[PDB]
Amino acid sequence: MKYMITSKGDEKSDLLRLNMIAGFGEYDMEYDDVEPEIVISIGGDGTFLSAFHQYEERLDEIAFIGIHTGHLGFYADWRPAEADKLVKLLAKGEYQKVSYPLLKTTVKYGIEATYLALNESTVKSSGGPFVVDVVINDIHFERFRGDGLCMSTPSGTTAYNKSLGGALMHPSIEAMQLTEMASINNRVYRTIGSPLVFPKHHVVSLQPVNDKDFQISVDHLSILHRDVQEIRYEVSAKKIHFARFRSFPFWRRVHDSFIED
Amino acid sequence: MKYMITSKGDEKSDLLRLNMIAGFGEYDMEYDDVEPEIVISIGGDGTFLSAFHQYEERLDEIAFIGIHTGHLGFYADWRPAEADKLVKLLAKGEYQKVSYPLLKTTVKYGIEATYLALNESTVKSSGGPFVVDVVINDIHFERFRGDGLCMSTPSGTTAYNKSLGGALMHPSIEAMQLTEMASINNRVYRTIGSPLVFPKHHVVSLQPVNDKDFQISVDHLSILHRDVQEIRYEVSAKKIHFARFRSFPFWRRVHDSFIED
Amino acid sequence: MKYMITSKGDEKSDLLRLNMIAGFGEYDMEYDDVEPEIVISIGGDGTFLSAFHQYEERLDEIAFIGIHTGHLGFYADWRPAEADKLVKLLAKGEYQKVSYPLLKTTVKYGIEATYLALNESTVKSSGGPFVVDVVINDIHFERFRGDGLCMSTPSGTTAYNKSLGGALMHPSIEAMQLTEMASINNRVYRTIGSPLVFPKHHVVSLQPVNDKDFQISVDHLSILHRDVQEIRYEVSAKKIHFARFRSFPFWRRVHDSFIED
Amino acid sequence: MKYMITSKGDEKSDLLRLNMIAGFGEYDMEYDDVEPEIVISIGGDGTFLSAFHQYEERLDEIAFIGIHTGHLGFYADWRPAEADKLVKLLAKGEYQKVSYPLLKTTVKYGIEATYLALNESTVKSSGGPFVVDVVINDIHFERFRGDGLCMSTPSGTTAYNKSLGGALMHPSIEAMQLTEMASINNRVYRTIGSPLVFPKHHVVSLQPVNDKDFQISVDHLSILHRDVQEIRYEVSAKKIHFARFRSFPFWRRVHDSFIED
Ligand SMILES: NCCCC(=O)NC[C@H]1O[C@@H](n2c(C#CCOC[C@H]3O[C@@H](n4cnc5c(N)ncnc54)[C@H](O)[C@@H]3O)nc3c(N)ncnc32)[C@H](O)[C@@H]1O
Ligand SMILES: NCCCC(=O)NC[C@H]1O[C@@H](n2c(C#CCOC[C@H]3O[C@@H](n4cnc5c(N)ncnc54)[C@H](O)[C@@H]3O)nc3c(N)ncnc32)[C@H](O)[C@@H]1O
Ligand SMILES: NCCCC(=O)NC[C@H]1O[C@@H](n2c(C#CCOC[C@H]3O[C@@H](n4cnc5c(N)ncnc54)[C@H](O)[C@@H]3O)nc3c(N)ncnc32)[C@H](O)[C@@H]1O
Ligand SMILES: NCCCC(=O)NC[C@H]1O[C@@H](n2c(C#CCOC[C@H]3O[C@@H](n4cnc5c(N)ncnc54)[C@H](O)[C@@H]3O)nc3c(N)ncnc32)[C@H](O)[C@@H]1O
């Protein structure tokens, strides 16, 4: 098939990429970075996120594979020593695909833009105080005051979400999880505190109270949005597809990354 | 239909029950506490849990309704002032049922018993230290040392689970959530810390390391089990069914109970 | 004595200030905003923090008093209805002073500046990733990766510190407390997690690892510092002095602000 | 001087004890377990706590030393390889003592008993629900509902207190810290949530609301108390004294135990 390989750009990753390209040259595999059907990421989870956003317009036609040249990643879960076995198995086909849910972010302005997240989307204030009204399925839920909010995909729950006290969710669950960043709670100000897990088709809307300018992040990309009227979150209808060649369960990846290896 | 009414047993609940029984007497409704098809709980969430465990062998043939005579409950979400409208609508039928997931607990002994939970099942030690091996789908995940563990249903996540730092999950998600009670973490002892959310068909097994005696709770019922070899958790194939007469969304119940009313 | 009155600037506060100024005019009290000995703050805790930083060069010669025109404050703990009794008692003297500890922040640059904090001093990164080496009394303690760090005074522990999970400390304890903002913890990255409480004369030093640019806040003031080589924290030798006219214990203020009133 | 040596009772500890006893036999050191002036603990922190409670009536006349034969302890902070250097230095004297604060627990009954804690004192319910009124210096602070409460010494803050989310406090601070175990917080029930740090002479009183029977722990000792009317906590006037032969700072012990070694 058509394939491409992205690299972290250091010496170890660039040369693994060149060696894998040489290995694919012994098969009916064409290097095409415009319309690939297999995207291999060599580096870390940051490199894998760049590869996902590089091709997020052809998610249904692409299967992703991640190789970690440093520590084990949650998306880059193949070792460099197995690049050869991977080259061959990818060329011989007969691999099954696995799909993870994604998060859709919609930003409406005053006087509309959509984004997909593989890890999470976060909202923070432009330096000053952060006050937003949280509306769930058109129902006003809370007035949040604090540092910000984070909405995570299932596979994203082991990332920022985990540091904010969120639960780890198996990626077979089509859901999104909202966590607070340093919420103020006293006699007059009140939030739920606990993380919130939302199913498919639930819409969470963040609406400004005073300042209309927010710092909005989608995975690694952080931008200042101005004249924002609403930020809408829902589980995407789209999915990211991985190529799977053997059993590496999610809970084993969790164990290997946080407990022991 | 056949119906029964359980009461908290205080003066307000007993007399609401007698008044509702009188109202049902004007319809084709027979009081039958052996094989009811409608079970009305009058009291609090504790009363509702007793009604659920009183009839957990006929869950598929029963629709539950809860009336709160004290504060608003998450299961007893009808006010006493609407008992009359409720009597009439229940008798005229034409109500839709909603279903919440349940948790199955299996306790195997040395030399097997199953339970259903509507809120959660918890495990603690018989006074001494609590050490269990946590195995997820036959994979050893962690050795837990601490006060205990709690496995919650979705509707249970606003109860003990919430106090232990777990996420609140919409009850349309068929899942279970595991939370830690005061886990020890140092150079030699290590747990994940974060709550864990498991989908249908995942099996979480707790296996003793030293002491084989544990205090096992299922909702309100707490018993000392001896010679335990394994405690198995999975989302039940069974569901509890509620009678619904108007829209009272889960996130609104969450708002009304924890934020404001 | 010489006194001055600062105001939040809204209608209620400005006119309470004018009425109190008229009341002081019936005593041997001179309005002097250059070298006052009594500083009265009318507004909220934000107004009181501005009054403290407005006169932090004469802390030993000033006793502070806060009046809250909105909700009860932890520093502005007098009601507007008692302004008259306060005018008279302040003029008749015979009040005792109470003193709270302060936090000294030192920022050293490449190729030195000091600040006092009444609530806390926080450090965040200039948008990118935040990595600092944490050194306690010249001993390398941890490499922190996350959103930032917060060092709180005792009276500051009910503010940002509380939202970050820190303990509430009685202000008679001469200490400072360090809390983490969303620290990453996995197989390769490790922090203590727990808040840390330091006694007098302990020095906590934050030293950059990669980026040398940080957003440093002292109470309400947040500035971007560039070419930073070190941020040093220690309990200040200076203290803020309050004028006390009756018993309003710290734990009662805590109760009134977070539990009920 | 007079000395004694307690042992964990395993093979490694018993024989280290016998070898140290032989080494002391070459000096003017008499083994006396009735009125020792030096108490050496060989084992873990549990062994050291037993040695402390074994001699808590002569705390002012005893200096403690802990040797860890397993992992590093916070009280047993000497390695077995340095037993010989320790034998000699203890016999030659010229060591300085360091003192850590202690926690006094008073249990009053219906129709009085005092305890000292080196780590903490905890209160839990006799199986049923735990409801106590929390009174600070005769002021009603909160009605606690949950699993229990823990009051920790400074050196105890790295133990149970840490697992409950409490702050780590340097042992030079004469204080005690109260942490909650799984408190319920909703519309009707309310606690502070945050850990609370109390100075010397502050008295925290726990008073029953319904059930008068509680499980009260002092360090490792857990007993069921009946007809309890009050549990009082305050920083003890007594102190535990350690023998110090070189610099091993508390924050380094924290680093070595929780971060890396
Ligand atoms: N030597 C670099 C040090 C800097 C570094 O923190 N780098 C990111 C770290 O995260 C891990 N990671 C990523 C990633 C990534 C790429 O950065 C962007 C993501 O930063 C996360 N992020 C941001 N601020 C965070 C915080 N305060 N705490 C925790 N994560 C935070 C967000 O979620 C972004 O989306 N995805 C997952 C995942 N799916 N599962 C578990 N681990 C994951 C990476 O292997 C790396 O260890
Ligand atoms: N005046 C009585 C004071 C005593 C009282 O705590 N009573 C239970 C409280 O819980 C609420 N509750 C229940 C219930 C119940 C019946 O008790 C058994 C349940 O105790 C929970 N439980 C046990 N220990 C807990 C703890 N430490 N913290 C929080 N909950 C805890 C477990 O989960 C049991 O299954 N279910 C839910 C729910 N689905 N959603 C939100 N709130 C819920 C009740 O209205 C009541 O406010
Ligand atoms: N309607 C305004 C909404 C905006 C507002 O959050 N305003 C500050 C709030 O705090 C209270 N406050 C202050 C203050 C202040 C003045 O702002 C600067 C302080 O913001 C704190 N701050 C910053 N980010 C925070 C966060 N994420 N969570 C909690 N606090 C946070 C820091 O600590 C600064 O130093 N000091 C204390 C105190 N000593 N004890 C208890 N409560 C305190 C104020 O009465 C007000 O409710
Ligand atoms: N292989 C045994 C496994 C069993 C074991 O947990 N054992 C106790 C563990 O603690 C450490 N420890 C002790 C101790 C002890 C002696 O037990 C009594 C103490 O258990 C603590 N304890 C009770 N339940 C706890 C919980 N859920 N989480 C954390 N600690 C808990 C209380 O605080 C008692 O007072 N003191 C300190 C200290 N000063 N600093 C840091 N670490 C400390 C010990 O080296 C050992 O690793």
Short mmCIF file of C-alpha atoms in Angstrom, two decimals, chain B residues 33-226:
data_model
loop_
_atom_site.label_atom_id
_atom_site.label_comp_id
_atom_site.label_asym_id
_atom_site.label_seq_id
_atom_site.Cartn_x
_atom_site.Cartn_y
_atom_site.Cartn_z
CA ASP B 33 -45.80 -7.89 47.69
CA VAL B 34 -44.91 -11.40 46.45
CA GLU B 35 -45.05 -10.89 42.66
CA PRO B 36 -45.46 -7.14 42.06
CA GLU B 37 -44.80 -5.46 38.75
CA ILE B 38 -44.42 -1.97 40.28
CA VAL B 39 -42.40 -1.39 43.46
CA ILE B 40 -42.78 2.06 45.05
CA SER B 41 -40.22 3.10 47.66
CA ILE B 42 -41.13 5.87 50.11
CA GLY B 43 -38.28 7.25 52.21
CA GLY B 44 -34.71 7.86 51.13
CA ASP B 45 -32.09 6.18 48.95
CA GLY B 46 -31.51 3.67 51.73
CA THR B 47 -35.17 2.66 51.59
CA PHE B 48 -34.89 2.36 47.81
CA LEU B 49 -31.83 0.11 48.07
CA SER B 50 -33.74 -2.17 50.45
CA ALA B 51 -36.61 -2.36 47.95
CA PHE B 52 -34.14 -3.27 45.19
CA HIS B 53 -32.50 -6.06 47.19
CA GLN B 54 -35.92 -7.22 48.40
CA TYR B 55 -36.86 -8.03 44.78
CA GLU B 56 -33.55 -8.56 42.99
CA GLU B 57 -34.70 -12.01 41.79
CA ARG B 58 -37.47 -10.47 39.62
CA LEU B 59 -35.62 -7.43 38.27
CA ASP B 60 -36.78 -8.02 34.69
CA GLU B 61 -40.48 -8.04 35.69
CA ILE B 62 -40.44 -4.95 37.95
CA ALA B 63 -40.29 -1.19 37.41
CA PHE B 64 -39.14 0.82 40.43
CA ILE B 65 -40.24 4.27 41.62
CA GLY B 66 -38.82 6.23 44.54
CA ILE B 67 -40.48 8.96 46.59
CA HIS B 68 -38.34 11.04 48.95
CA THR B 69 -40.01 12.27 52.14
CA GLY B 70 -36.76 13.87 53.30
CA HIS B 71 -34.10 15.38 51.06
CA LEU B 72 -34.00 14.64 47.34
CA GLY B 73 -32.55 11.24 46.54
CA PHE B 74 -30.81 10.05 43.39
CA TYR B 75 -33.17 7.05 43.22
CA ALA B 76 -36.08 8.55 45.20
CA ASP B 77 -36.56 11.54 42.90
CA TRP B 78 -40.31 12.18 43.29
CA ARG B 79 -41.77 14.64 45.79
CA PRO B 80 -44.54 13.57 48.19
CA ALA B 81 -46.81 16.31 46.82
CA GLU B 82 -47.02 14.46 43.47
CA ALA B 83 -48.15 11.12 44.92
CA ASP B 84 -51.67 11.64 43.52
CA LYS B 85 -50.52 12.43 39.98
CA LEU B 86 -48.22 9.40 40.30
CA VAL B 87 -51.01 7.07 41.45
CA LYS B 88 -53.11 8.07 38.44
CA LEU B 89 -50.35 7.93 35.82
CA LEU B 90 -49.15 4.54 37.08
CA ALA B 91 -52.69 3.18 36.80
CA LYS B 92 -53.28 4.67 33.34
CA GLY B 93 -49.99 3.13 32.20
CA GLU B 94 -48.37 4.70 29.14
CA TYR B 95 -45.07 5.30 30.94
CA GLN B 96 -41.67 4.44 29.53
CA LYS B 97 -39.04 2.46 31.41
CA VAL B 98 -35.40 3.45 31.85
CA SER B 99 -32.68 0.94 32.73
CA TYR B 100 -29.46 1.39 34.74
CA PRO B 101 -26.49 -1.02 34.75
CA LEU B 102 -25.69 -3.22 37.73
CA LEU B 103 -22.52 -4.72 39.21
CA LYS B 104 -22.04 -8.46 39.66
CA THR B 105 -19.83 -9.59 42.54
CA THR B 106 -18.62 -13.19 42.78
CA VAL B 107 -16.94 -14.46 45.95
CA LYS B 108 -15.07 -17.76 45.67
CA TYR B 109 -14.06 -19.64 48.81
CA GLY B 110 -11.42 -22.19 49.69
CA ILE B 111 -11.87 -25.96 49.76
CA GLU B 112 -19.09 -19.61 45.21
CA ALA B 113 -21.59 -16.81 45.89
CA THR B 114 -22.86 -14.04 43.63
CA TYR B 115 -24.34 -10.63 44.45
CA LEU B 116 -25.81 -7.71 42.53
CA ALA B 117 -25.04 -4.12 43.54
CA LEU B 118 -26.96 -0.99 42.61
CA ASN B 119 -24.50 1.42 44.22
CA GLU B 120 -21.22 -0.43 44.77
CA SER B 121 -19.35 -3.35 46.29
CA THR B 122 -16.42 -2.67 48.61
CA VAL B 123 -13.70 -4.82 50.17
CA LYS B 124 -11.87 -4.06 53.42
CA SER B 125 -9.65 -6.09 55.73
CA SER B 126 -10.71 -7.78 58.96
CA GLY B 127 -9.05 -5.07 61.05
CA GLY B 128 -5.46 -5.83 60.11
CA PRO B 129 -3.66 -4.81 56.93
CA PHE B 130 -5.35 -5.05 53.54
CA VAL B 131 -3.19 -6.53 50.76
CA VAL B 132 -4.76 -7.86 47.55
CA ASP B 133 -3.46 -8.62 44.08
CA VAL B 134 -5.50 -6.83 41.41
CA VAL B 135 -5.88 -8.86 38.21
CA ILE B 136 -7.63 -7.39 35.15
CA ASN B 137 -8.71 -9.92 32.50
CA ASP B 138 -6.20 -12.49 33.84
CA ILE B 139 -3.38 -9.88 33.77
CA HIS B 140 -1.74 -8.93 37.06
CA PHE B 141 -2.17 -5.16 37.32
CA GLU B 142 -1.06 -4.12 40.81
CA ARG B 143 -0.52 -5.23 44.39
CA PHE B 144 -2.80 -2.95 46.40
CA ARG B 145 -1.95 -2.03 49.98
CA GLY B 146 -4.27 0.32 51.82
CA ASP B 147 -7.67 0.56 53.48
CA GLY B 148 -9.78 -1.06 50.78
CA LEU B 149 -11.28 -0.90 47.31
CA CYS B 150 -14.66 0.16 45.94
CA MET B 151 -16.27 -0.93 42.67
CA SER B 152 -19.17 1.30 41.66
CA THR B 153 -22.00 1.18 39.15
CA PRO B 154 -22.69 4.31 37.08
CA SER B 155 -25.61 5.39 39.29
CA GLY B 156 -23.40 4.47 42.25
CA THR B 157 -20.68 6.92 41.20
CA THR B 158 -22.40 9.79 43.05
CA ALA B 159 -22.26 7.83 46.33
CA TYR B 160 -19.19 6.28 48.06
CA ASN B 161 -17.30 6.46 44.75
CA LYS B 162 -17.60 10.26 44.74
CA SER B 163 -16.21 10.55 48.28
CA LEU B 164 -13.19 8.48 47.20
CA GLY B 165 -12.40 10.84 44.31
CA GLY B 166 -14.05 8.86 41.52
CA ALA B 167 -15.62 10.34 38.43
CA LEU B 168 -19.36 10.78 38.02
CA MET B 169 -20.59 8.71 35.08
CA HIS B 170 -23.85 9.06 33.19
CA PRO B 171 -25.89 5.88 33.81
CA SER B 172 -26.29 5.23 30.07
CA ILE B 173 -22.67 4.00 30.06
CA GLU B 174 -22.42 0.26 30.75
CA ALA B 175 -19.35 0.35 32.97
CA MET B 176 -17.95 -0.08 36.47
CA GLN B 177 -15.46 2.13 38.30
CA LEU B 178 -12.78 1.06 40.79
CA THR B 179 -11.52 3.50 43.42
CA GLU B 180 -8.84 3.15 46.09
CA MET B 181 -9.21 3.80 49.81
CA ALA B 182 -6.01 5.33 51.22
CA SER B 183 -3.40 3.46 49.21
CA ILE B 184 0.20 3.49 50.43
CA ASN B 185 2.72 4.66 47.83
CA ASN B 186 6.45 4.81 48.51
CA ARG B 187 9.67 3.40 47.08
CA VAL B 188 8.57 -0.24 47.47
CA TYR B 189 4.74 -0.06 47.26
CA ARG B 190 2.99 1.22 44.14
CA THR B 191 -0.60 1.54 42.90
CA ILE B 192 -2.13 3.42 39.99
CA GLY B 193 -3.93 5.85 42.32
CA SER B 194 -6.34 7.06 39.66
CA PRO B 195 -9.86 5.63 39.49
CA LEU B 196 -10.31 2.99 36.79
CA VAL B 197 -13.36 2.70 34.52
CA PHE B 198 -14.03 -0.73 32.99
CA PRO B 199 -16.36 -1.59 30.10
CA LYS B 200 -18.72 -4.53 29.78
CA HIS B 201 -17.11 -8.02 29.77
CA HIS B 202 -13.94 -6.88 31.57
CA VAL B 203 -13.34 -8.91 34.73
CA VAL B 204 -11.49 -7.46 37.73
CA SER B 205 -10.29 -10.08 40.22
CA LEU B 206 -9.06 -9.42 43.77
CA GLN B 207 -6.92 -12.22 45.17
CA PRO B 208 -5.53 -12.42 48.73
CA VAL B 209 -1.82 -12.25 49.48
CA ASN B 210 -1.71 -13.06 53.21
CA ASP B 211 -4.92 -12.78 55.22
CA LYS B 212 -7.82 -14.57 53.52
CA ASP B 213 -10.55 -12.85 55.58
CA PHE B 214 -12.21 -9.70 54.24
CA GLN B 215 -15.14 -7.44 55.03
CA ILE B 216 -17.21 -7.39 51.82
CA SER B 217 -20.03 -4.89 51.36
CA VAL B 218 -22.75 -4.94 48.69
CA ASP B 219 -24.58 -1.62 48.85
CA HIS B 220 -25.75 -1.37 52.48
CA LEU B 221 -25.05 -5.02 53.41
CA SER B 222 -21.62 -5.64 54.99
CA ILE B 223 -20.51 -9.15 55.97
CA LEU B 224 -17.26 -10.81 57.02
CA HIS B 225 -16.21 -13.48 54.52
CA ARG B 226 -13.69 -16.13 55.55
#
